[PDB]
Amino acid sequence: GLPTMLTPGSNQFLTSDDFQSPSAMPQFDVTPEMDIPGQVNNLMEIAEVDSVVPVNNTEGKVLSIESYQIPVQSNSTNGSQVFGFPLMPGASSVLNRTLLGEILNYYTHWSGSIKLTFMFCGSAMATGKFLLAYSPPGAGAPTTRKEAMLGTHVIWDVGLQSSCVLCIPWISQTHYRYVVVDEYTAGGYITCWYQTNIVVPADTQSDCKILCFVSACNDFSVRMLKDTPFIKQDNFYQ
Amino acid sequence: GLPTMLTPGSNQFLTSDDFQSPSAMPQFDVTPEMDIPGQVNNLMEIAEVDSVVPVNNTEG
Amino acid sequence: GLPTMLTPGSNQFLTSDDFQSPSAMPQFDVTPEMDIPGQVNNLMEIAEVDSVVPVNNTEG
Amino acid sequence: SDRVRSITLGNSTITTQECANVVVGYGVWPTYLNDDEATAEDQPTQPDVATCRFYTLESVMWQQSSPGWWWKFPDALSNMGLFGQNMQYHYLGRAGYTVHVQCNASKFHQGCLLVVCVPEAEMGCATLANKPDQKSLSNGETANMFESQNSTGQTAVQANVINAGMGVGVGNLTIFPHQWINLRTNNSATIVMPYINSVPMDNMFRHNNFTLMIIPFAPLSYSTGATTYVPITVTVAPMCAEYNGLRLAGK
Amino acid sequence: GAQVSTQKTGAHEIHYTNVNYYKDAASNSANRQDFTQDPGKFTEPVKDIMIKSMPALN
Amino acid sequence: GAQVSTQKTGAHEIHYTNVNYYKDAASNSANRQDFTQDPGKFTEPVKDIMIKSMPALN
Amino acid sequence: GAQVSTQKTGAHEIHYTNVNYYKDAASNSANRQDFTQDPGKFTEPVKDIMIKSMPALN
Amino acid sequence: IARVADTIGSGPVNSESIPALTAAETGHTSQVVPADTMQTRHVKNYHSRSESTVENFLCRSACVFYTTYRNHGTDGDNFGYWVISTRQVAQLRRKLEMFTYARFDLELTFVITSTQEQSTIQGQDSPVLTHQIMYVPPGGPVPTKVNSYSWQTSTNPSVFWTEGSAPPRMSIPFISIGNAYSMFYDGWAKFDKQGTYGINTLNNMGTLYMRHVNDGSPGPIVSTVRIYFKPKHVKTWVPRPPRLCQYQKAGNVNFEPTGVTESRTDITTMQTT
Amino acid sequence: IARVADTIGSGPVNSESIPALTAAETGHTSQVVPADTMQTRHVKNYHSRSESTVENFLCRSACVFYTTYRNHGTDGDNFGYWVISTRQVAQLRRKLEMFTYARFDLELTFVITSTQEQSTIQGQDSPVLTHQIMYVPPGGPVPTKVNSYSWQTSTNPSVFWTEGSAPPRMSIPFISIGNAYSMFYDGWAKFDKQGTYGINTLNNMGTLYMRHVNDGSPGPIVSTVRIYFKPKHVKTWVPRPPRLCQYQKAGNVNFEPTGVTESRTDITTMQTT
Amino acid sequence: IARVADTIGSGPVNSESIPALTAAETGHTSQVVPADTMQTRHVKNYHSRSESTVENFLCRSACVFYTTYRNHGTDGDNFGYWVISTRQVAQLRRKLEMFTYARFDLELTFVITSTQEQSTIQGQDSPVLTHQIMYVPPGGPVPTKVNSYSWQTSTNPSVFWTEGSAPPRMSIPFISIGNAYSMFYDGWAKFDKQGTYGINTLNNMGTLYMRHVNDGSPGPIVSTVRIYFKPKHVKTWVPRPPRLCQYQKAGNVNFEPTGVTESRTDITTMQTT
Ligand SMILES: CCCCCCCCCCCCCCCC(=O)O
Ligand SMILES: CCCCCCCCCCCCCCCC(=O)O
Ligand SMILES: CCCCCCCCCCCCCCCC(=O)O
Ligand SMILES: CCCCCCCCCCCCCC(=O)O
Ligand SMILES: CCCCCCCCCCCCCC(=O)O
Ligand SMILES: CCCCCCCCCCCCCC(=O)O
């Protein structure tokens, strides 16, 4: 027959190969396709959807719905912090279990801008201004509002529009980042402060809740599929 | 010769495969085909024929 | 299938061979190339550069 | 403005002066099954007025420690007028739903409810070896309540709200068609759900296949002297309901 | 002499190539897609046409 | 019947050939380069257009 | 899509064919014959032209 | 090309347009880009989403089960079987269960390995082993012995494989009676709602049977077969949240309640993690 | 395309046409569709009959026999033979016997496996084995010993095979002297009607002979060869009812009388089954 | 064609042009040819620089590591791992480090060899061995036992290989997050400059895991896997002087100070060497 030479890689099973194989059921007539709603072609269409962030994931709150609730109240001082966490959508426990972070853990590299939506779930008679800040790495995390306004921020005025978006722009020295925690690809810090106080009338609750959502922008992307550290197994499910 | 790489499934016997094989009897001259009545091309032509049903299939 | 004959050199690993192999990471999107200064295409571009000679390479 | 809205189906109408918008499924409006998607051959029934109309379920009372509620459909409508009747006499069925959840407050009240429709919401039992009994999954017109602690019971559903009965993250439920009732913003939420399934029609008594969940992410709150009885009413309407396989009634 | 045919695909929303290597026609592969049907031999073997809507016997 | 397609290459500074061997369409290789995206189903499922710069609610 | 190139032969007194089989451009074989040379980067990096026969410094 | 959007240049703004303010109650996810809340430069983004397609995310060979069979047996009773399911492993089950409905073809691969057992049957010189995997669709005759008549495989598809060669592989089309494979089922099997509840209602794929085609030699031997699934030509519908709690059973979605995430010290600790 | 018929729409009827009434005495099978006795909708049916063609129904490799031969023998007398027939297995015999006449080419495949035998001949280190299957058509010289001259195969077709490689396969054309293979024969071999009656009259296909080409080593070894038939390029005539009673012999259609079906309790019990 | 320059003919000269005199202080390397300081003939030079291209200089398979794993283990703990780096071997490290930046695809090849160990477990007759190399990118779940769940490789790329066949090979694209691989890094990992200094800051390529897919037989066995790297589609930037001192560590460029060259007797000794 045709003279041929075998090359390295023959008779090997590489789990990510694209070859053609014979069908064990020849001439099988598959069921006709149907128009089902909600077809997904890319996993990035799932990461681009809002999901609540458990910012208040403290030691006791984590087993409760109070993990998602960010407490804001009327203060007697000025410029207090409300929350703060690092920009690590894959490694930070504040983000790695959302729809965006759950998808990142299947991949080794990410890139793009992030959105952080905030809904003010207090009364209609309550009013407040909040400073949502992002600070790239290189200096520490800000510890006062005076150091947070030097970075990228949005002053949020509460009112008829209950939500506000802090877009975390892509400011890195590389094109991609590692989903795991790495010092070379640090991301920065997200912080929230009081630009004013929560001013409320009489017979109203001074304590309010705020909600966080996280979703990817239209320039977001992932790379280098891997397995998740989130699911495990000891033996076969019977 | 032509460089080639072997892929999974080589040297396997799958009982429902479509391949060409050499004829052990080369140049054999088969008997001429005849027009026999009742040729069947599909098994659904057999299922489309009436057959009596044993509805009274009791114990005896 | 296509009748083929294996020739000498099959299943050998020659460290200076040019063959195609499957990618373990299909559809990977590499980082965009950048214009870095000082690209080298030939090693003779390095030998054509002056370098100091230790002519007085005596024992001490 | 865009906060007002009216929805007329059959001999029923719902007006809302404080809404957000309509969420339409996955961008698909409910329609009738086409000839090239159908597989059942008999001419289907389409009541089209007596069934495609609004039905109001039993109201619940939002309290400061309410974890949430859930309904199964169309089991919740299995006894609602002629829609339940056609379900009993027919083997196969098909519908889409307009869902209208309504909760009003006093503008001094606070709290945020998540309103979501989960397709194929299979729920786990409190005992890992057993299966949840029929009543724990769907009480019909009555809401099944989430718990804010681990559930117990041989046939009980694992109704701890943090996993939403399904073993997922409750904050990740926004992947499904959802909305929010935020008492400072709007008093109602409406979702139009098309028919979603792996078959063109299904039996309406042994399959749902979407659940309606109402989960307060921000608890109800008010100062003393305000109204403390804040109910949540649910009004669902089947859209484009058709039926195949007529025979004796059941179940 | 290569034959490009249509593969078996699904309906309601794709070619393969074939070359013969041997000199005998029996060495070829199976005729997996010979779709012919003539059920009238076995289901309507009667002499008269026997229209459906009409009575079979007068 | 050979299909020449474009390989996956890098951007900012290359074809492969494909032949189908089997009669079934399931025997083919994977559709590694079916790049389609419609995120509007899940991110903007609302009835009205909801322009960005405008207020969401009046 | 077959590429016929010139083999490496001797001077002073011969094609091969190439087909790509895989969908990724990294699966291809090496660029053994990319003969480009720009030694001026390293041997003449000076600002002025510096003609040979002329004195380097006035 | 699954190329991401370029970043547009934007200067200072002072106007009535409010891109950052919205109503999250609507269910609409805001489409704000970074060019709406800060002065941006122009970036020609060449990054592509080619690796997050559902085909590439799912088209990876994954082991779904392995079982063992011996050569001596009693009596015997030295063969293997597997009732086909995709829910006995954690890794592939969680990927398939990110969607409610899926349609795909499979690439099936086997990895059969044999082990010598402890004994005193010296000396042993055993010829190469040949394995037969038979697939019996629902309703067909089941093998009862290692040499029963069902192994004839007159109509049942079977692959014969000798050790030392490439692992066997074959393609399976989309074979369900529904228009899509269901990962989730929220109903019962019986109309009165008694009996099996959940995704086990739709599990009727069949069974695989394995044996040695060789007659047993004096030296004891145990072989293990690893099945690998690879989804091909994928189509997914209705994505759902990824599984958070660890699986317990294969037939149902029963779980033990789990925390939403990993906890941290306080609301402002940057040590995360 | 073996595409089934679409369902046509039909409304109410009141007329003299009687599609449901007929005469079953005529032997005609009624052509009533569901659109004749009820209001139907329009269904575009995309189901095809591609899998019930006689080619696909029959084009499956099936084992038809296996026999054993040893390496030591006496004296010897260590080789195998099979008088070719398709009636020694139940599974393939019942499929072929759904028709009265068939014309096809065959794909012949062998699966040869060797087993070590109990002994005390330690230690054994045996080189790879090579098998020779010889086909002797009717009238040719038969092998009498494992090393007789007939194995030269000057004109008799033979395949040589070494263990550890792909199972050997070759194609056979349609070789009968008649215009079709007969599954059934309702006559005798002799004109006076004495002698063999039935399908054994036409069984003159030949014989297969198997042996080890190697000289026997000290360690005892037994090899088994499995023959697999695969009908190709099929043409069938005159279908007949499937065999209901279990086969008893290979040469004849002798049976033990069997019930028509499985019985049930009464004429109205819905527990069937 | 990487063809060198022809030699031009040149006769006697007497003029003011001074091709031999220059200023080496300028950093310019003089472009004098032999035809500037002597009468040359005309030579048609057919020599080419095809072999000193960076592709040919680097496109050679080189072993970068080998490690051993056993079949018995405890308990076990009989598997191998390698944190991927190009700096654990001297030969390939010095070639890659002649440049500061490089972009290339890799051809990865493995050479797995097994050895029998000293024991008294006679007699041993072990079937062929099958190895599984798994690659875990940074952040993925690590194998803790030789049979842990991570070996399922649902999303992690793995190659299965049986002994006796061609060594396995696969291609890897350029995978760095930067625009080029760095051979040299003159900074720290942390902004305060505490912690790792140097090229180890950018080493986050991943890890390889190896094991026997077979269950362990009674006879002890140790296997060694040799990894071979081959740069492909190369692009290099900023060449630097070749390493003169012998390497000491893999993470850093630490060295022991070495003489510039080999010494000789005096400034005029022609015995060099
Ligand atoms: C000789 C080998 C033949 C084996 C054929 C195996 C065919 C079984 C079907 C496999 C597909 C099952 C996919 C189910 C998906 C789900 O339940 O979510
Ligand atoms: C070296 C191998 C050659 C073997 C050739 C075998 C040829 C024997 C004929 C096989 C066809 C028999 C089919 C008979 C059908 C019937 O009797 O119903
Ligand atoms: C199943 C095998 C898959 C293995 C995939 C290995 C991919 C690891 C990356 C190798 C490239 C590393 C090159 C670094 C160069 C440098 O640091 O100078
Ligand atoms: C089963 C797929 C076969 C692919 C083609 C390989 C065999 C060689 C094809 C040669 C085509 C030219 C011959 C001709 O003119 O018909
Ligand atoms: C994966 C690369 C396949 C290379 C081509 C080998 C197969 C034979 C090609 C024959 C081309 C002619 C057939 C045709 O007309 O389409
Ligand atoms: C390395 C030499 C490869 C020789 C060619 C074998 C591969 C099949 C070639 C098919 C050519 C037609 C495909 C095309 O149109 O480009």
Author numbering:
A (entry chain C): 1 to 238
B (entry chain C), C (entry chain C): 1 to 60
D (entry chain B): 10 to 260
E (entry chain D), F (entry chain D), G (entry chain D): 2 to 14, 25 to 69
H (entry chain A), I (entry chain A), J (entry chain A): 11 to 283
Verbatim from the authors:
The genus Enterovirus within the Picornaviridae, a family of non-enveloped viruses with a positive single-stranded RNA genome, is comprised of more than 100 serotypes. Human enteroviruses (EV) are presently classified into four groups, Enterovirus A-D (EV-A, B, C, and D), among which EV-B, the largest group, consists of over 60 serotypes, including all 6 serotypes of coxsackievirus B (CVB1-6), coxsackievirus A9 (CVA9), over 30 serotypes of echoviruses and more than 20 newly identified enteroviruses. The capsid proteins (VP1, VP2, and VP3) adopt the classical eight-stranded anti-parallel β-barrel configuration with the N-termini residing inside and the C-termini exposed on the surface. Most of the uncoating receptors bind to the “canyon” sites of the viral particle, dislodging the “pocket factor” in VP1 and subsequently triggering conformational changes of the intact particle to release the genome, albeit that SCARB2 binds EV71 outside the canyon.
Given that three key structural elements of the VP1 GH, VP2 EF, and VP1 EF loops dominate virus–receptor interactions, we systematically calculated pairwise Euclidean distances between all amino acids for all possible (n2) pairs of these three key elements from 15 structure-available human EVs, which defines a k (k = (n2)) dimensional space delineating the structural characteristics of the receptor-recognition sites. The phylogenetic tree could clearly separate these human EVs into three groups: EV-A, EV-B, and EV-C. Within each group, viruses with distinct receptors were further grouped into mono-phylogenetic clades. This structure-based in silico analysis completely matches the results of experimentally derived receptor identification, therefore, it can be used to deduce the receptor usage for human EVs. To test the robustness of our structure-based algorithm, we determined the structures of three other human EVs (CVB1, CVB5 and Echovirus 3) and put these into our algorithm. The in silico analysis suggests that CVB1 and CVB5 are CAR-dependent human EVs and E3 utilizes FcRn as a functional receptor, predictions consistent with experimental reports.
